[PDB]
Amino acid sequence: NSFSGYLKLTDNVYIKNADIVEEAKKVKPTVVVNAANVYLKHGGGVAGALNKATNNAMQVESDDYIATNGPLKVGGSCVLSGHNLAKHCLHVVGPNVNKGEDIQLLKSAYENFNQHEVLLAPLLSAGIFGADPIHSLRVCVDTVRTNVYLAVFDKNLYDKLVSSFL
Ligand SMILES: COc1ccc([C@H](NC(=O)c2ncnc3[nH]ccc23)[C@H](C)c2nnn[nH]2)cc1
C-alpha cells in the first residue's frame, strides 16, 4: 500500500491523476476495485485495462465465478484474486443510469468499499454508465468510511474534481 503523490480530500478519501493499472503495478495494494458489470465481462474502460494487464487471467477466473454463482446485482460486488496487480480485486457494479438503472444504487455500490480497510479504486458509474463524475465523487465521500485512494486517468476530469471539491 505504498501510495505516493495523492492529494487528501477528506480524512479517508485521497485522489491522484494516474492510470489505475500503473498504480496497481507500483503499489501492489491489498485491494484494487474494478468498475464491473453484472456478468463480469471486462470489455473496456477500467475493466478492460485491468484484465489486459493480467493477460486475460482475470477474465478466465471471472467466467468461472459466473458459472458457479450467477451474475452480480446492480449495487453489489464480489471479491476475486488480484492476480499480479493486487492481493484481491473487488468487482463492483454501479448503476448504468443511461439504461434506466436507479442512481440511488450508486450509494449501495460504494458501500461495498467499507468491507476493506484500504482500497485503490476508480470513480463508479462515470463514462458510458452516464452518472456525472463530480456527483459520483460526492457519493463516494459521503458513503465510504475506510481509506480509499482514487486514481483518475483524465487530467481534465482530475482538475474539475479538485476544483469542485476543495
Ligand atoms: C462504467 O464505469 C466507468 C467508471 C470509470 C470510468 C472512467 N475511468 C477510467 O476509464 C479509468 N480510470 C482510471 N484508470 C484507468 N485506466 C484505464 C482506464 C481508466 C472515468 C470517466 C475516468 N476518467 N478518468 N478517470 N476516471 C468510465 C466508466
Curated annotation (Swiss-Prot):
State the activity regulation. Inhibited in vitro by GRL-0617.
| Effect noted on mutating T30A | In strain: Mu/B.1.621
The protein's annotated catalytic reaction(s) are: Thiol-dependent hydrolysis of ester, thioester, amide, peptide and isopeptide bonds formed by the C-terminal Gly of ubiquitin (a 76-residue protein attached to proteins as an intracellular targeting signal)
Q: Which domain of life is it from?
A: Viruses
Domain (Macro): residue spans on this chain: 1-166
* Compartments (UniProt record): Host endoplasmic reticulum membrane
User: How is this protein positioned relative to the membrane?
Assistant: Multi-pass membrane protein
Q: What does this protein do?
A: Responsible for the cleavages located at the N-terminus of the replicase polyprotein. Participates together with nsp4 in the assembly of virally-induced cytoplasmic double-membrane vesicles necessary for viral replication. Antagonizes innate immune induction of type I interferon by blocking the phosphorylation, dimerization and subsequent nuclear translocation of host IRF3. Also prevents host NF-kappa-B signaling. In addition, PL-PRO possesses a deubiquitinating/deISGylating activity and processes both 'Lys-48'- and 'Lys-63'-linked polyubiquitin chains from cellular substrates.
Assembly behavior? May form homohexamers. Interacts with N protein.
The protein's name is Papain-like protease nsp3
Q: What species is given as this protein's source? A: Severe acute respiratory syndrome coronavirus 2 (2019-nCoV)
Of the parent protein, the shown chain spans: 1026 to 1191 of 7096
